[PDB]
Amino acid sequence: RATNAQFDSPEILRRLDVRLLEVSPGDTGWDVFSLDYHVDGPIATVFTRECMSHYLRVFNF
Amino acid sequence: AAAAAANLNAVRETMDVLLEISRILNTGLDMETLSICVRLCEQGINPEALSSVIKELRKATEALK
Amino acid sequence: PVLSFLYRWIYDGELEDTYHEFFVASDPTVKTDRLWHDKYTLRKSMIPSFMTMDQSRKVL
Amino acid sequence: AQQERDVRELVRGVAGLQDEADPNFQLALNFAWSNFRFHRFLDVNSHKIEKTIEGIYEKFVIHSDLSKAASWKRLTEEFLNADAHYSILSLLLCLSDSPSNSSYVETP
């Protein structure tokens, strides 16, 4: 709401949300952070879950 | 016995599989320690009770090092 | 009969034969979202001679 | 019988005390038995453990060590032939993470 990110339709803004990974006993926030785009429409047919790992890896880098 | 030897061979196989599993789960144990743990949960004991012990005992040997 | 099955596959878009006479092999499962990729499979024995492989893929 | 022997050996080895007349050994042994005779513990559910093994395998493929991930799934699949399995497994899980190796001396 503070920055320029808000300017888009509420559905795709809702579909972006934070996400955790497998936690460690020796945990920190820099160990575990991710963004999750939610696919619940028919659009899962065009984007599969193995390509989501790629976005995660590039975002991690 | 002969089948008891091949059984013992398979127990060496299982403790090596568990050694791979320990080394990429990157624990403080060596082979002989996890053998003792295998004895402990072969007779039936809590892993959540053993883990707190191993976790303070490894911290109670850096306390007087 | 063949051509009526063909127009059962263009103006209906659904395979309904209880016998194997058509070049499409419909699956009983109707999946969740992997439906589109996998439910329809080319039967390569009920390809007739007046229809090449290209035509069958295209109409499928 | 042999449980008490195993407890004494584990505390002697891991705590690195090779004297049984050390009072620190005795206090740690009393600590250990008081911990064992106490129970507040969530008795483990095997289904959660299976999901955890899957999640570790997923974290392996996310961080792109495919040989480690595939060997890990293959080893766990071979291991679960024929309860004691899950006990041992969850112990190994609980004891440490936050780092990962890459499996030297592997051709089988």
Q: Please give the method by which this entry was determined.
A: cryo-EM
Whether B15 and chain D come into contact, CB under 8 Å, resolves to no
Most D CBs within 10 Å: which of B54, B56, B58, B62, as the mutation test of the D interface?
A: B54
Contact B25 D102 (CB under 8 A): no
Residues D22-36: b if buried by 16+ CB within 10 A, e if exposed: eeebeebbeebeeee
Break sites following residues in chain A (C–N > 2.5 A): none
Cβ(C44)–Cβ(C23) under 8 Å? yes
Cβ(C8)–Cβ(C21) under 8 Å? no
Measured in angstroms, the CA of C38 and the nearest CA of chain A are apart by 11
Locate the chain B residue with the closest alpha carbon to D1. B43
Strands C24-26 and C40-42: antiparallel
Helices (H) and strands (E) in chain D, counts: 5, 0
Say how many residues make up chain D.
Answer: 108
